[PDB]
Every structure is written in structure tokens, then in C-alpha cells.
Amino acid sequence: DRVYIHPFHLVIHNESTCEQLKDPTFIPAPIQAKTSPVDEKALQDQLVLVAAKLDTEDKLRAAMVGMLANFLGFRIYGMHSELWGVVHGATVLSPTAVFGTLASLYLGALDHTADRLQAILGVPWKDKQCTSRLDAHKVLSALQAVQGLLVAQGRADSQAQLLLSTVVGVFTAPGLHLKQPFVQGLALYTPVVLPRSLDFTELDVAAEKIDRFMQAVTGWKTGSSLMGASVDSTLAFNTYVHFQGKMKGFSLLAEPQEFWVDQSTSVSVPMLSGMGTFQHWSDIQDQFSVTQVPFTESASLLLIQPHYASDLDKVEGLTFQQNSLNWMKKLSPRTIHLTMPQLVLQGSYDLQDLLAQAELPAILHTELNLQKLSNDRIRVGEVLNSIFFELEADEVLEVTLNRPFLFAVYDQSATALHFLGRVANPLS
């Protein structure tokens, strides 16, 4: 039947798919076993290929999971007193990644675990039929679509250069047998999946093995020491995402400028500077200014500066809600000279912490049923999201971000927030 309880009909199973009625397993090679580094340029070529053969229906599904990811992102802010206390390193977040990580857990979940994970993703069910449940395959492929759509815009635009890499590291205990169809499912989300076996009895060394392995294979830094891992841990599900967006007609100024973290304190920071006609709007009631700088026609960097420095947290509350996507319309063109810090940010967080008030720890530790992932004993050490975020260089209103500000990168193709962030200090 047609769906009414939610407007997300394209992400659930259908009649043919549902009620279809002895699963190959394997031990991933040891982490030390030498692997080829990821060819990012070859990965970017794969993602454009995904996007360039998306039918109309597939395009709508991409926009749908974009919306769901966004909503979860806003839920995650609404449930935290100090959200950024959880995030190690730079204060950046990825709704798309977080949604993909939960969707990957759901992929290998059953019974009450699956129900609770589907609940957090934010798509309910009106009965315990098969057709009311989430189609992980459609969700995971749809998330690769929004990645594809973003990077394809970058190619089509002669000026712009967008780059988005997502790699998943599934690290298991020695002897833990992974199910083949689970790995087959992750491959829908991203082409770079790295299942490797790893001894967790020495967490101090295990962390170094991962950091070295991930740094060798990617070339990015992480520094995630499995802070909340135990000796009984037999699984670490880590998502590493890299973003690099070229700023149209911006130059890196040779001389630095002062960035005011406090009323009293400043810090010397390298700054980007650029002229152009950008979308701008002042909210006089709530007291903040939004400035949009396009990467492409449909993908942009939103820059929210509060009118007063003390209202940052207050204005952040107005940024991270459903309303924020309404004021995309209230923008209008302005000739602007923007000056903002060169952002080269690395941050990481555990979802277990992010979604503590949605009782994700309870789901992943009490009465766990991840039998679609593995029949062995699964005890989750960390569910990590590592983010590496770069902004590189190539009458009139002077916009200057020499004090704390919020940012987001948004793609209208799939109506998706790839990154929400906050810059209290542009270095560390």
C-alpha cells in the first residue's frame, strides 16, 4: 500500500524485494598485511560514474536521504548541552557520514536492534510487516549518490574543484568471521572498504596499528586512540572522510591577520581573501548575517556570523534546526569582499557519545543482535567518524571573519548538508 505515516517511501523495501526466502563468511587479512594506498583520483572517477548513470527515481532517493541526514544532524544538536565537548580536535560534523554509519550498523542488525536503529534514522513503521522496514541497500547506495552528485558538479564546473573521499575501516578481533553479504552492502556506500583483523587485547598498540595503517593507506592524519575501547572489544567500525573545496577567485594573503577568539585575546592566522557577487542576508530579529560562497551552481559554503560575539551559542541554536533551510530563500545578491581564515581542520568523534541521549550505547551493548554482520561475539570498541576538511585558494560590503563563526557546506542537488561546523580557533 501507499505510505502515509512518513513521506520517505523510496528508502523502504517493496513487495518484490520483501519476503524473499548458508551465508559465506571469512576472516579479514591482518592489518599489517600490506595494502595498496587509495587512489583518490581513481575514486573521484568512480563517483562521477555513479552520478552520471543515476535515473530520475535514484535522483529523488538521493535527495530523500539528504533530508533524513539533515534531520538527524539537527536532532543531534538538540539533545546535547555542549555538543562540541564530545568532538576531539576541530569542531566539525558530517550528517551524511553519521547517517551512513548508523545505516551500516542497521545493515547488519536484526529484531529490536534493527527497530531501534531504524527509529534513530527517523523513519517509523505502522506494522511489523517487511514492507514497512528500511531498505539498507537503497539507503547506502543513495548516500553514495549524494557523494557522486557533489563531485560530478566539480567536474562539470570548469572553475571549481570539489573532492570528497569516504573510506570505511572495519577492524575485527582475530577469528571473528564477517558475513560476506554485509561487506557486499558496505560496498554500496563507498568503493573503499578496508576489513582487517586486529588484536584488541593491547588497545595501546591496537590504536597505533590503526593510526599507522589508516595514515599509510589514505595519507591523512587521525590520531584516534580508541578512548572508550575495552579488552573485550571485538569490532571497531570507523568512517574516514576527506573534503577539499576550491574557493572561486580567492587568494591566500601572504601577511596573516588577527583572529579574535576572545574579547581580550587574538591569534595570528593565514587568511583567504576574495571579491565577487555572493548571496547575503541579515537577520535583524535574531541578530546574525549569513554569507554564501558557491563551489558550484548548486553546492555552496554557508558562513553564519553573529552580530555580537556573545550570541554565538544562541545563534548556533537557530542554525541547527529545520528552519535553517528556509532562510536559503531569504538570501539575495550582494557585492562582497570576504576575508576568512584558511580552514585545514581535522576532527573525530564516536557516535556512541553523539547519540548518548538516543540511547545508542544501550542499543550497541544490551541485547545486541548484529547476526547479519557476524555470528561470533560482537562487542563494539568504537564507532568513529574522522573528518579532514580543507578550504584551498584558487557599493561593496566588507565581510570579515576575524572572530568565531559557524559554517556549513550544502548541495541543493540532494538537499544535503555534507558538513556542519564551528570555528572558535582556526588552528591546533
Residue numbers in the entry: 1 to 21, 30 to 402, 417 to 450
Cite, word for word, the article reporting this structure.
Subsequently, we prepared spent AGT, where the N-terminal 10-residue angiotensin I peptide was removed from the AGT-N14 expression construct and loop-cleaved AGT, where AGT-N14 was cleaved between Gln412 and Leu413 by thermolysin treatment. To confirm conclusions from biochemical experiments that cleavage of the reactive center loop of AGT does not trigger the stressed-to-relaxed (S-to-R) transition characteristic of inhibitory serpins, we solved the structure of AGT cleaved by thermolysin treatment and compared it with that of intact AGT. Loop cleavage indeed induces no significant conformational changes, with an r.m.s. deviation of only 0.28 Å over 371 Cα atoms. The cleaved loop is disordered, but is not inserted into the central β-sheet A. In contrast, it has been shown that AGT has lost the ability to undergo this typical serpin S-to-R transition, confirmed here by our structure of loop-cleaved AGT, so it was very puzzling why the serpin framework was selected in the course of evolution as an angiotensin carrier.
